[PDB]
């Protein structure tokens, strides 16, 4: 890797330039790079890692909706045709995200998730798990999109089983675990009422546990219980 | 689109 | 080149699917790819090209811009060392946006300019290589920096030149010439006064020649006279 | 900064 000369406070303090450059494939890169160091990750490189990606894949997702919406139009009786040029477009941009996504679960695998014992890091890492399937779930369309769908609902799973044994429900990594698997449902397994009621238990669970926090644990947590909020005034 | 984080 | 083997006009219709989904860099490699088929640009061609390419070189002059102000007050007094890195990281994003700079002067050399006959065509393509100089130049701090300054000065005045003789006062590319040429004048040749007379005059001048046009032209020639006007603002 | 197009 390219990445293998530099030193890993360096690759570390580069990401967070990058951050500040909004250069997030660069800030991705310089992560990668990081964690095939081969130590552990702490908190803060844990949320590195997750920003550097969350910005490039979130990019290359925007951008293949607005492809495929062409492509479908395309495919609408009366469009007139105008050759391969959409899909194959479409296609690059798939297989680029595609290749995000199998990057991101390969240092998962390799081996982020097996060095994880901390409740606080290996849901971490599950979830993301779970996500980046999720990702490849949205443009999967072969023999393999039951498989990766079941492969996102696993890595969900292990992690709520876990947020709910290990940490309280005000947790933002619990809250934000429930978020992204109550989307998983709704909008991957066609499960819009599993959808609703996670969100809707994992809001009122949340609220209860407030009194515990103090006041910037209380703000952390708030933001992304009015996210679960946010989701629910949408579904119904 | 739903929010995720 | 990588796009040797796709058709012009697919690269064209690809262009405009990037635009759609904002992936410049995409967007770019494919005007690339259609410039290099060695047939003269189109006016809607140009544009592309033109876009692309400002796109991507305005993302990397934002970056390098935090990174340089990063590195600059990492050497003011009283701030602690924190190694090469800013440095490297800021070298790092100058290099590309240099070496994007290099590639679009070399599709204007090889060979955009020498093959534009029409004063449209040849003003726009003259504007776009005093506008990469330019962005060299913000860089540059080495033997070669005046040299890089006048290359962009003499690109300007060219255009410059043959606009005033071609093209009436209210034509957007003379405009948009004038609008850049005077924002060199006050950026990097330390010349306000060149620039705040050569907005003032370009205004007042195109200001006079409205009564000549459609209203879809004075739509298009106002816009640009705003920006003159909102330099203007900024600079006195 | 100012304004280019
Ligand atoms: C190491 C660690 O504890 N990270 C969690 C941290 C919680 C607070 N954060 C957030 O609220 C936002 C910015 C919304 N992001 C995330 C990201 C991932 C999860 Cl699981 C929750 C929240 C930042 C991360
Ligand atoms: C082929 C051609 O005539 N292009 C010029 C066209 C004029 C109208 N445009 C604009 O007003 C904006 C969008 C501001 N962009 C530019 C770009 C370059 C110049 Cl020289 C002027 C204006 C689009 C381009
Ligand atoms: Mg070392
Ligand atoms: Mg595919
Ligand atoms: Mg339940
Ligand atoms: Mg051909
Ligand atoms: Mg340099
Ligand atoms: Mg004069």
Redesign the interface.
């Known amino acids: 890797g390219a990445m293998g000369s530099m030193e890993r406070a ?1 690759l570390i ?2 990401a967070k ?2 951050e ?4 997030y494939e ?1 800030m991705a890169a310089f992560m990668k790079g990081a964690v095939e160091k081969g130590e552990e990750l702490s908190c803060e490189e844990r949320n590195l890692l997750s920003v550097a990606y969350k910005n490039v894949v979130g990019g290359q997702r ?2 293949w909706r ?2 495929s919406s ?1 492509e479908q139009k395309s495919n609408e009786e009366g469009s007139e045709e ?2 391969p ?2 899909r ?2 479409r296609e ?2 798939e297989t680029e995200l595609q290749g995000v996504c199998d990057t991101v679960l390969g240092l998962l695998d390799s081996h982020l998730i097996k060095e994880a014992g901390d409740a606080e890091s290996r849901v971490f890492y599950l979830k993301m798990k779970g ?1 980046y399937y999720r990702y490849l779930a949205e443009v999967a369309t072969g023999d393999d999109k039951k498989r990766i769908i079941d492969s996102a609902r696993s890595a969900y799973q292990e992690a709520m089983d876990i947020s709910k044994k290990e940490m309280p429900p005000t947790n933002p990594i619990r809250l ?1 675990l429930a ?2 698997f109550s ?1 998983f449902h ?2 991957i397994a066609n499960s819009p009422e599993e959808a609703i009621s996670l969100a809707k238990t994992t809001f009122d669970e949340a609220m209860a546990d407030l009194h515990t926090l103090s006041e910037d644990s209380y703000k952390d947590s708030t933001l ?1 219980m009015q ?1 679960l909020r ?2 629910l005034t ?2 119904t | 689109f739903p929010a995720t984080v």
Chains 1, 3 share one sequence.
């Open positions: 360096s303090q580069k330039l990058a500040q450059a909004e250069r660069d925007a951008a607005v492809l062409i105008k050759g040029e959409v194959e477009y690059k941009v996500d934000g978020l992204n989307v709704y909008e992304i996210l946010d989701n949408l579904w």
